[PDB]
Amino acid sequence: FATELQSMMYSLGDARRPLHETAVLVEDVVHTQLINLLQQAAEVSQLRGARVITPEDLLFLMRKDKKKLRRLLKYMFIRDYKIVKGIDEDDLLEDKLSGSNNANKIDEVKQERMERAERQTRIAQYAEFCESRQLSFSKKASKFRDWLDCSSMEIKPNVVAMEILAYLAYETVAQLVDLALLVRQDMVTAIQPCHIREAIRRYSHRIGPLSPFTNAYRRNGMAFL
Amino acid sequence: MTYIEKRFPEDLELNAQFLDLVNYVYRDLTAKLEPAFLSGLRCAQPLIRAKFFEVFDNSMKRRVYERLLYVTCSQNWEAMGNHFWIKQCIELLLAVCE
Amino acid sequence: KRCFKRYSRSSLNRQQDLSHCPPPPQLRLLDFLQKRKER
Amino acid sequence: LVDFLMQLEDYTPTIPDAVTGYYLNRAGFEASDPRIIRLISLAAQKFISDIANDALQHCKMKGTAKYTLTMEDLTPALSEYGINVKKPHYF
Amino acid sequence: IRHSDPESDFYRGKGEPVTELSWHSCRQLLYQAVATILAHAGFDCANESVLETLTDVAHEYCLKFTKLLRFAVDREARLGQTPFPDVMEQVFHEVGIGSVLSLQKFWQHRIKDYHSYMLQISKQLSEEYERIV
Amino acid sequence: PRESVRLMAESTGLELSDEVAALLAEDVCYRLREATQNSSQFMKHTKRRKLTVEDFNRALRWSSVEAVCGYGSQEALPMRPYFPEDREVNLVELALATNIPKGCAET
Amino acid sequence: PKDAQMMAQILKDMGITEYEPRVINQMLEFAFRYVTTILDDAKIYSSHAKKATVDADDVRLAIQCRADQSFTSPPPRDFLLDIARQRNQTPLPLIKPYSGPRLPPDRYCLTAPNYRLKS
Amino acid sequence: TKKKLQDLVREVDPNEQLDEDVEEMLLQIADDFIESVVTAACQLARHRKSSTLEVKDVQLHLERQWNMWIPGFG
Amino acid sequence: ESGCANIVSAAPCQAEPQQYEVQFGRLRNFLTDSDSQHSHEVMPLLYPL
Amino acid sequence: ALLSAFVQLCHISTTLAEKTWVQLFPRLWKILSDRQQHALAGEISPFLCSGSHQVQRDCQPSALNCFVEAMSQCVPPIPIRPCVLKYLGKTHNLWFRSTLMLEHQAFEKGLSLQIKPKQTTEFYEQESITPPQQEILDSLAELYSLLQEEDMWAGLWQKRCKYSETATAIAYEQHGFFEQAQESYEKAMDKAKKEHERSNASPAIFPEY
Amino acid sequence: KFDHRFQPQNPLSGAQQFVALCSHTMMLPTRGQLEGRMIVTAYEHGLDNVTEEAVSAVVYAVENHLKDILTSVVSRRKAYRLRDGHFKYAFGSNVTPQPYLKNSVVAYNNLDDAEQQAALLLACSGDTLPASLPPVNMYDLFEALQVHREVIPTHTVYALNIERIITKLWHPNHEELQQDKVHRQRLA
């Protein structure tokens, strides 16, 4: 599984022959987040009543931020066409629960990512960047079934939620690399595992309401990204 | 709007007729023609500038400090990048006099 | 009471701790000087 | 286009100034000028509206397999913020 | 053109003091304020204890926010230097609000957009009534 | 006693042994007795002898315990032998019906 | 309503004869929340105990963890004595009568204007 | 030797100084943190089957009260 | 004063072959230069030292 | 009629228009009392830093050259954040004007140069980490280096220096003797290495290293 | 009457037996120094088969805990900006603009070429001479723990340390101020 990891880190900001144990730590972090994602979706399915993963569950969990909503709409519109039923399902899900914002369809994050990607191609590096595209959870599926689905006793994904978790894992890696670069920025003014460790620590401590002067508002399952 | 005056910086009647169209609709939403409005204050004729100055002065109050803020924070000089726009600032600071 | 604590037999953390310490990144010519002398 | 000064005029507060002002008096503030006591009311509105919108999402996915608020729509919405409420329904 | 004219009493700290209330009258206004905003969210009926739980949480949230501001105000009164240019900017950071400039986006996307959307449904249903009848 | 522990244990989902609820009930009594003692210090020292809701909340706040939210100050929650709270009231008429900001508090 | 009478008796045993009808229900809710939380703590310990039934030792550990963090008490009779011992060597400043109650030096007082704002 | 206290400060904020009396307090904070963790870990060690081992897996279950998660294997 | 001991336990128990004259030499350089108002009560102190 | 005709003459002549602005802005500034000047002073700083003024960088007659010159004869001081002056006097031909106002500013605020006669062992107040009048002197030193005025730049470092070898090495290099200056720099580098290990980073000398 | 009132249970009675530092060394505990402390404290509890992964987890837990303490302290003295929620990354200069300026509002709404953007952040708000704060004294850390109270949830650790923090509070009095004045009037 490390060979797939080595290829995808080239498309990120930690390219030019990074270490291999760092990708192992990333794999462990991604595996824990995906297990937590499976665990967190269990209560929603139990609360709903159905014994199978509904297609609206994956978008109901990720209902907090709208910037990540836009990226999911982009991935289900253009890259998910080369489809017809999923476009109407998303519209039905959008109209199922929306008041002002979700009934709609510059983010300063993806634009930075594409600007950074264009910067890496200025250094044949352009040929290497092109061949690294579409190499994340797309060539094989039998091994990805073994990495996940430990028990799979009560609720299982049928055809579609298998790919959604793969895209979320890819977005988790992209956000994890983005947080690593943010920590590396404080250093100047190959990435050491101390950078990712600090990013996890900063991402764990939230600034949620009713926090000060009390040590009873404890923590729960952090997130799924 | 910006695709007419870029290639002929030499017309005297075509530009005047076009600006006669620009300031006529202003007197009568279509409130996004900022490059078209600001380009008519400098092109070829004082009379065109005077006509555009009338709708540019009657749209505000005869105050000193309010016009001082306008030329710094409110108004953007992105339209004319190769012109000495302080000449227009002299008009605003002298139009509030007796 | 504070400065006596740094003078009353505290050299173990001053002349033994601080030896063979990597130079700060602000001074990057001392390493070049050492390499030229060694080579 | 327009600075925040008159945008502060555009807001229509719901909590009266006699509630937010009393809160400042408890903590030791005068609460005698109109301008500072509008963000606390807006911040209070945002805190409750987010919970209200979250409760609306739970209520509209109750048993679809008029709108009445119960504990089933309150204890999961308060769980993310750290509020743990558990009230017995009998005796 | 709308720019802040510095000719008024609102731009400064000059203002009429707020009338002092008691504990009994403050809770009733809290109940009224909470009831109106929940109905604006899209609700039509609710229980009494659920309202009481929400008011107490809001009361505790307001107390913690107001108390946190007080420790911020008196801490800078002895130093003279401020980490953030505004005391009100600071207290949002420990609470969770990004900035005061995020309030306009929240208001626009939860009041104006909701009202504009809510009106269109009424207009659409009015046409349906005219078409059916 | 011990029967009350078993009843709410059943609502939790699993029953409890008869040799465990006795210690659990003793622990509950100790905590409530200590909570009343903590609330007494705030009570008999300012100037009063009457129990209030806020005094119990303050004791929980200073003991690193979550404050109970949901109970007001007026006398309510009757018992007719059973804790029904199905008072379906509309918020439309409760918005602007009768209001007055007069405090009338002078020294 | 058997809990109402004993709770009033508990308050009566502490020298309180006047109360409000809402505090009694609050303590009942507090008791319900306390046991419900500690039973859940027993469940996670029992689930981590790879045992089907729930043992009694897990409750003892669970209540031990609850008292460790969720309850506050000062250190009695031993730690405060050390504080007085380590501060017993601190002397006392001399009394210099000039006008009586002098004040701490300038800067270390709540009299300082904001640097940014000016005239 | 390596990473005494100053490099950890640079790990967060490049320009920050600590007073001489503050450094010892932080070490005592770490000293108390070490003892609290190992005592609780040993208590869980004696709880598995009256004693089994110091286990990294049960340490993960212990860190729920600290609201922290180790990036380790688990 | 019955057995006063403040720095007795923390006495400078070091070899220090070359400390007295360099230290006492610093005393005359600082206490006899640029000081006249606070020097009259401390000038006699250098004699018994 | 005179005002309208005077405006027309300002349109045809650029020199007349820019001279009128320089002679009018201070005169209109005096009319305003101490009520709107503070608001305008804090609002004009972003305008000087706005991103729409980079188009006329190549134009020798610039609308920003005489704009900043107009707000220099006003008797009420105006906050400027003189760190911007380093960037303004780099692209809009404001080299000597920015330096002159820097010398007008950083000489009457503290009435004392940063020399640190003693170490941080006798002072019990601990004012601040960064000494006052430090960023402004660094910007002033950068302007002198860009202008290649080594005689003026050398004098600045001879007063703000802390070590006795940094200024000595500069003085040697000022009149030949490059080998001796190079040895003096090396004697300064290892001397700081001896002191740097015993203490913290001591952020008092950033650009000396 | 008075006999019905209970008495608090003394926690001092229940103690552990004792049959048989990393504080003055100015060091963070390394892998070798912690090994001796684990084995000596596990003999009392009766543990065998000393592993290695547990030692590393404890060391990293200490490293994260100390980072949280310093992050909490600095955050009460310096400014920062939030990215997509709770993430603190800047911990630096005054790139945050003043929200009462319309130029900042349009700049907020908007979000060779790199240097001008840095100017838009580093020069659109602040004072001419930004004075830095004094180093962290015993007062700043004392107030930091009062407000947050989240860094140390255990009462056995937070309590015993906070009174030691109180005993370390110090500031110069009037008498020392003249000595600073006398010294300042001597070098001039």
PDB file of C-alpha atoms in Angstrom, chain A residues 61-191:
ATOM      1  CA  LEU A  61     -22.561  13.931   8.169  1.00  0.00           C
ATOM      2  CA  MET A  62     -20.634  16.591   6.215  1.00  0.00           C
ATOM      3  CA  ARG A  63     -23.263  19.328   6.638  1.00  0.00           C
ATOM      4  CA  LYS A  64     -21.265  21.774   8.778  1.00  0.00           C
ATOM      5  CA  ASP A  65     -19.008  23.679   6.371  1.00  0.00           C
ATOM      6  CA  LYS A  66     -20.199  24.896   2.974  1.00  0.00           C
ATOM      7  CA  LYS A  67     -16.762  25.084   1.325  1.00  0.00           C
ATOM      8  CA  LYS A  68     -16.439  21.295   1.523  1.00  0.00           C
ATOM      9  CA  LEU A  69     -20.036  21.092   0.277  1.00  0.00           C
ATOM     10  CA  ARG A  70     -19.002  22.908  -2.911  1.00  0.00           C
ATOM     11  CA  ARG A  71     -16.127  20.495  -3.574  1.00  0.00           C
ATOM     12  CA  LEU A  72     -18.425  17.482  -3.185  1.00  0.00           C
ATOM     13  CA  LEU A  73     -20.866  19.060  -5.649  1.00  0.00           C
ATOM     14  CA  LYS A  74     -17.970  19.630  -8.060  1.00  0.00           C
ATOM     15  CA  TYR A  75     -16.792  16.017  -7.758  1.00  0.00           C
ATOM     16  CA  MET A  76     -20.315  14.649  -8.297  1.00  0.00           C
ATOM     17  CA  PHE A  77     -21.001  16.925 -11.294  1.00  0.00           C
ATOM     18  CA  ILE A  78     -17.990  16.901 -13.629  1.00  0.00           C
ATOM     19  CA  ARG A  79     -15.814  13.994 -12.488  1.00  0.00           C
ATOM     20  CA  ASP A  80     -18.895  11.826 -11.818  1.00  0.00           C
ATOM     21  CA  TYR A  81     -20.263  12.133 -15.382  1.00  0.00           C
ATOM     22  CA  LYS A  82     -17.741  10.296 -17.581  1.00  0.00           C
ATOM     23  CA  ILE A  83     -24.504  10.274 -12.991  1.00  0.00           C
ATOM     24  CA  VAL A  84     -28.017  11.062 -14.214  1.00  0.00           C
ATOM     25  CA  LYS A  85     -29.676   9.530 -11.144  1.00  0.00           C
ATOM     26  CA  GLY A  86     -27.090  10.929  -8.717  1.00  0.00           C
ATOM     27  CA  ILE A  87     -27.673  14.484  -9.965  1.00  0.00           C
ATOM     28  CA  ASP A  88     -31.380  14.247  -9.109  1.00  0.00           C
ATOM     29  CA  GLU A  89     -30.620  12.504  -5.805  1.00  0.00           C
ATOM     30  CA  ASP A  90     -28.342  15.370  -4.756  1.00  0.00           C
ATOM     31  CA  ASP A  91     -31.026  17.898  -5.712  1.00  0.00           C
ATOM     32  CA  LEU A  92     -33.638  15.895  -3.794  1.00  0.00           C
ATOM     33  CA  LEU A  93     -31.298  15.679  -0.796  1.00  0.00           C
ATOM     34  CA  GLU A  94     -30.560  19.410  -1.037  1.00  0.00           C
ATOM     35  CA  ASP A  95     -34.289  20.206  -1.034  1.00  0.00           C
ATOM     36  CA  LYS A  96     -34.943  17.623   1.702  1.00  0.00           C
ATOM     37  CA  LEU A  97     -33.348  19.758   4.443  1.00  0.00           C
ATOM     38  CA  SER A  98     -32.469  23.362   3.595  1.00  0.00           C
ATOM     39  CA  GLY A  99     -33.562  26.822   4.714  1.00  0.00           C
ATOM     40  CA  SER A 100     -31.369  29.467   3.048  1.00  0.00           C
ATOM     41  CA  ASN A 101     -27.879  28.188   2.190  1.00  0.00           C
ATOM     42  CA  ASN A 102     -28.067  24.538   1.090  1.00  0.00           C
ATOM     43  CA  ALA A 103     -30.729  25.380  -1.534  1.00  0.00           C
ATOM     44  CA  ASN A 104     -28.189  26.963  -3.880  1.00  0.00           C
ATOM     45  CA  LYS A 105     -26.724  24.231  -6.106  1.00  0.00           C
ATOM     46  CA  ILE A 106     -13.922  32.052  -4.235  1.00  0.00           C
ATOM     47  CA  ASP A 107     -12.976  29.646  -1.439  1.00  0.00           C
ATOM     48  CA  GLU A 108      -9.306  30.665  -0.905  1.00  0.00           C
ATOM     49  CA  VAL A 109      -8.315  27.023  -0.293  1.00  0.00           C
ATOM     50  CA  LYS A 110      -8.725  25.091  -3.543  1.00  0.00           C
ATOM     51  CA  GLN A 111      -7.547  28.130  -5.517  1.00  0.00           C
ATOM     52  CA  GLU A 112      -4.381  28.087  -3.404  1.00  0.00           C
ATOM     53  CA  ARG A 113      -4.057  24.346  -4.060  1.00  0.00           C
ATOM     54  CA  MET A 114      -4.266  24.818  -7.834  1.00  0.00           C
ATOM     55  CA  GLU A 115      -1.864  27.768  -7.657  1.00  0.00           C
ATOM     56  CA  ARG A 116       0.528  25.585  -5.656  1.00  0.00           C
ATOM     57  CA  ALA A 117       0.059  22.760  -8.175  1.00  0.00           C
ATOM     58  CA  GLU A 118       0.898  25.128 -11.041  1.00  0.00           C
ATOM     59  CA  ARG A 119       3.978  26.295  -9.122  1.00  0.00           C
ATOM     60  CA  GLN A 120       5.260  22.713  -8.844  1.00  0.00           C
ATOM     61  CA  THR A 121       4.960  22.319 -12.632  1.00  0.00           C
ATOM     62  CA  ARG A 122       7.192  25.356 -13.243  1.00  0.00           C
ATOM     63  CA  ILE A 123      10.253  23.333 -12.189  1.00  0.00           C
ATOM     64  CA  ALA A 124      10.216  16.937 -17.284  1.00  0.00           C
ATOM     65  CA  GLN A 125       8.323  17.801 -14.102  1.00  0.00           C
ATOM     66  CA  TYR A 126       5.154  18.572 -16.078  1.00  0.00           C
ATOM     67  CA  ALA A 127       5.155  15.039 -17.502  1.00  0.00           C
ATOM     68  CA  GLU A 128       5.583  13.542 -14.022  1.00  0.00           C
ATOM     69  CA  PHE A 129       2.699  15.652 -12.689  1.00  0.00           C
ATOM     70  CA  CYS A 130       0.393  14.464 -15.483  1.00  0.00           C
ATOM     71  CA  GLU A 131       1.158  10.771 -14.897  1.00  0.00           C
ATOM     72  CA  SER A 132       0.490  11.129 -11.150  1.00  0.00           C
ATOM     73  CA  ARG A 133      -3.140  12.126 -11.792  1.00  0.00           C
ATOM     74  CA  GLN A 134      -5.944   9.649 -11.028  1.00  0.00           C
ATOM     75  CA  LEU A 135      -3.687   7.300  -9.041  1.00  0.00           C
ATOM     76  CA  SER A 136      -5.567   7.562  -5.716  1.00  0.00           C
ATOM     77  CA  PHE A 137      -7.938   4.677  -4.912  1.00  0.00           C
ATOM     78  CA  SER A 138      -8.826   4.142  -8.580  1.00  0.00           C
ATOM     79  CA  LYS A 139      -6.664   1.344 -10.039  1.00  0.00           C
ATOM     80  CA  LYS A 140      -7.538  -1.411  -7.547  1.00  0.00           C
ATOM     81  CA  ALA A 141     -10.560  -2.263  -5.412  1.00  0.00           C
ATOM     82  CA  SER A 142      -9.974  -5.761  -3.978  1.00  0.00           C
ATOM     83  CA  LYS A 143      -7.182  -4.584  -1.665  1.00  0.00           C
ATOM     84  CA  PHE A 144      -9.148  -1.502  -0.580  1.00  0.00           C
ATOM     85  CA  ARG A 145     -11.997  -3.824   0.425  1.00  0.00           C
ATOM     86  CA  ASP A 146      -9.592  -5.703   2.712  1.00  0.00           C
ATOM     87  CA  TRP A 147      -8.124  -2.576   4.334  1.00  0.00           C
ATOM     88  CA  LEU A 148     -11.600  -1.438   5.406  1.00  0.00           C
ATOM     89  CA  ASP A 149     -14.674  -3.536   6.297  1.00  0.00           C
ATOM     90  CA  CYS A 150     -13.324  -5.326   9.359  1.00  0.00           C
ATOM     91  CA  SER A 151     -16.609  -6.718  10.713  1.00  0.00           C
ATOM     92  CA  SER A 152     -19.331  -5.461   8.326  1.00  0.00           C
ATOM     93  CA  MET A 153     -21.996  -7.347  10.262  1.00  0.00           C
ATOM     94  CA  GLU A 154     -25.026  -5.020  10.336  1.00  0.00           C
ATOM     95  CA  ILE A 155     -24.698  -2.133   7.842  1.00  0.00           C
ATOM     96  CA  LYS A 156     -22.589  -2.229   4.674  1.00  0.00           C
ATOM     97  CA  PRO A 157     -22.147   0.089   1.678  1.00  0.00           C
ATOM     98  CA  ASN A 158     -23.645  -1.347  -1.493  1.00  0.00           C
ATOM     99  CA  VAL A 159     -22.089   0.294  -4.565  1.00  0.00           C
ATOM    100  CA  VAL A 160     -21.635   4.013  -4.012  1.00  0.00           C
ATOM    101  CA  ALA A 161     -20.491   4.711  -0.449  1.00  0.00           C
ATOM    102  CA  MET A 162     -17.337   2.682  -1.143  1.00  0.00           C
ATOM    103  CA  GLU A 163     -16.038   5.405  -3.472  1.00  0.00           C
ATOM    104  CA  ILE A 164     -17.245   8.265  -1.250  1.00  0.00           C
ATOM    105  CA  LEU A 165     -15.037   7.083   1.617  1.00  0.00           C
ATOM    106  CA  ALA A 166     -12.108   6.823  -0.810  1.00  0.00           C
ATOM    107  CA  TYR A 167     -12.595  10.448  -1.877  1.00  0.00           C
ATOM    108  CA  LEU A 168     -12.928  11.547   1.757  1.00  0.00           C
ATOM    109  CA  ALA A 169      -9.681   9.734   2.583  1.00  0.00           C
ATOM    110  CA  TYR A 170      -7.999  11.565  -0.303  1.00  0.00           C
ATOM    111  CA  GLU A 171      -9.387  14.864   0.994  1.00  0.00           C
ATOM    112  CA  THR A 172      -8.162  13.911   4.474  1.00  0.00           C
ATOM    113  CA  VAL A 173      -4.634  13.482   3.094  1.00  0.00           C
ATOM    114  CA  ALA A 174      -4.869  16.803   1.244  1.00  0.00           C
ATOM    115  CA  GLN A 175      -6.030  18.591   4.399  1.00  0.00           C
ATOM    116  CA  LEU A 176      -3.391  16.768   6.463  1.00  0.00           C
ATOM    117  CA  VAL A 177      -0.668  17.933   4.066  1.00  0.00           C
ATOM    118  CA  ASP A 178      -2.128  21.456   4.104  1.00  0.00           C
ATOM    119  CA  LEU A 179      -1.936  21.513   7.908  1.00  0.00           C
ATOM    120  CA  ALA A 180       1.663  20.262   7.740  1.00  0.00           C
ATOM    121  CA  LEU A 181       2.602  23.146   5.433  1.00  0.00           C
ATOM    122  CA  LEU A 182       0.910  25.597   7.810  1.00  0.00           C
ATOM    123  CA  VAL A 183       3.096  24.325  10.673  1.00  0.00           C
ATOM    124  CA  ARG A 184       6.221  24.436   8.486  1.00  0.00           C
ATOM    125  CA  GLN A 185       5.502  28.122   7.808  1.00  0.00           C
ATOM    126  CA  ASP A 186       6.072  28.980  11.484  1.00  0.00           C
ATOM    127  CA  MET A 187       9.460  27.228  11.330  1.00  0.00           C
ATOM    128  CA  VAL A 188      11.155  29.420   8.703  1.00  0.00           C
ATOM    129  CA  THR A 189      10.047  32.685  10.327  1.00  0.00           C
ATOM    130  CA  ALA A 190      10.794  15.837   3.315  1.00  0.00           C
ATOM    131  CA  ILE A 191       8.681  16.755   6.354  1.00  0.00           C
TER     132      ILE A 191
END
